[PDB]
Design an enzyme around this catalytic site. Structure first.
Site, mmCIF file in Angstrom:
data_model
loop_
_atom_site.group_PDB
_atom_site.id
_atom_site.type_symbol
_atom_site.label_atom_id
_atom_site.label_comp_id
_atom_site.label_asym_id
_atom_site.label_seq_id
_atom_site.Cartn_x
_atom_site.Cartn_y
_atom_site.Cartn_z
ATOM 1 C CG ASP A 29 -8.074 8.910 -0.768
ATOM 2 O OD1 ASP A 29 -8.429 7.744 -1.035
ATOM 3 O OD2 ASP A 29 -8.856 9.893 -0.720
ATOM 4 N NE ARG B 263 -3.741 2.386 0.588
ATOM 5 C CZ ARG B 263 -3.643 3.713 0.532
ATOM 6 N NH1 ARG B 263 -2.468 4.297 0.208
ATOM 7 N NH2 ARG B 263 -4.701 4.462 0.823
ATOM 8 N NE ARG C 282 -3.520 -2.316 2.820
ATOM 9 C CZ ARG C 282 -4.301 -1.290 2.491
ATOM 10 N NH1 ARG C 282 -4.904 -1.280 1.318
ATOM 11 N NH2 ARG C 282 -4.476 -0.293 3.350
ATOM 12 C CD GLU D 34 -10.627 1.213 -3.414
ATOM 13 O OE1 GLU D 34 -10.742 0.144 -4.054
ATOM 14 O OE2 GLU D 34 -9.765 1.393 -2.534
HETATM 15 C C1 LIG Z 1 -1.825 4.564 3.681
HETATM 16 C C2 LIG Z 1 -2.126 3.871 5.001
HETATM 17 C C3 LIG Z 1 -3.351 3.287 5.138
HETATM 18 N N1 LIG Z 1 -3.598 2.671 6.384
HETATM 19 C C4 LIG Z 1 -4.928 2.072 6.651
HETATM 20 C C5 LIG Z 1 -5.862 3.219 7.053
HETATM 21 C C6 LIG Z 1 -7.250 2.720 6.550
HETATM 22 O O1 LIG Z 1 -7.855 1.855 7.523
HETATM 23 P P1 LIG Z 1 -9.417 1.561 7.291
HETATM 24 O O2 LIG Z 1 -9.470 0.265 6.377
HETATM 25 O O3 LIG Z 1 -9.888 1.125 8.636
HETATM 26 O O4 LIG Z 1 -10.234 2.644 6.550
HETATM 27 C C7 LIG Z 1 -6.839 1.943 5.288
HETATM 28 C C8 LIG Z 1 -6.942 2.716 3.981
HETATM 29 O O5 LIG Z 1 -6.433 1.846 2.965
HETATM 30 P P2 LIG Z 1 -7.193 1.912 1.528
HETATM 31 O O6 LIG Z 1 -7.279 3.371 0.954
HETATM 32 O O7 LIG Z 1 -6.343 1.046 0.654
HETATM 33 O O8 LIG Z 1 -8.685 1.464 1.705
HETATM 34 O O9 LIG Z 1 -5.501 1.486 5.472
HETATM 35 C C9 LIG Z 1 -2.655 2.611 7.375
HETATM 36 O O10 LIG Z 1 -2.936 2.080 8.489
HETATM 37 N N2 LIG Z 1 -1.447 3.184 7.239
HETATM 38 C C10 LIG Z 1 -1.158 3.814 6.042
HETATM 39 O O11 LIG Z 1 -0.101 4.417 5.937
#
Ligand SMILES: Cc1cn([C@H]2C[C@H](OP(=O)(O)O)[C@@H](COP(=O)(O)O)O2)c(=O)[nH]c1=O
Length: 129
Positions: A34, A29, A75, A37
């Site tokens: 952001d 990730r 991830r 999707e």
């Molecule tokens: C980019 C990033 C996302 N995340 C988490 C926050 C969000 O949790 P939530 O799933 O609870 O919304 C999610 C967003 O990823 P996605 O944009 O891929 O959905 O991944 C992290 O924990 N650390 C990070 O640096």
């Protein structure tokens, strides 16, 4: 920070988020973005954009920040590079993602990405059109 090698692992559904890192499969990730999707506005454009960048690269590298290396979903959290060009930055610069998810410790490239977003917005690109 340090860049380390990875390779793309082909997926049945065509996504380009799984890389082989130290010999093991890992979904990465991208830090600090952001990304819309598929069913959101600019979703298909962002996916086509990253896919072209990663699939055409001779060399993929991942660069961890100073904080957490994996998220709660397992991830890898990293800056991803395709022949030296950062995917996270290139998406932002083209108005195909927004700067987001800025957590402490993993924010080394924040100001670099915010500059890219400012330029993308000034140019009315994509999300900013
Ligand atoms: C980019 C990033 C996302 N995340 C988490 C926050 C969000 O949790 P939530 O799933 O609870 O919304 C999610 C967003 O990823 P996605 O944009 O891929 O959905 O991944 C992290 O924990 N650390 C990070 O640096």
């Amino acid at each position: 920070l340090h860049k380390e090698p990875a390779t793309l692992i082909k997926a049945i559904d065509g996504n380009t988020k799984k890389l082989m890192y130290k010999g093991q499969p890992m979904v990465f990730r991208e830090l600090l973005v952001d990304i819309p999707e598929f069913n959101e506005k600019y979703g298909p454009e962002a996916a086509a954009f990253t896919k072209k960048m990663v699939e055409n690269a001779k060399k993929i590298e991942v660069e961890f920040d100073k904080g957490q290396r994996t998220d709660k979903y397992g991830r890898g959290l990293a800056y991803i590079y395709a022949d030296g060009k950062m995917v996270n930055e290139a998406l932002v610069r083209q108005g195909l993602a927004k700067v987001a998810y800025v957590y402490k410790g993993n924010n080394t490239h924040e100001q670099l990405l915010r500059k890219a977003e400012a330029q993308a917005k000034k140019e009315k690109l994509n999300i900013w059109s």
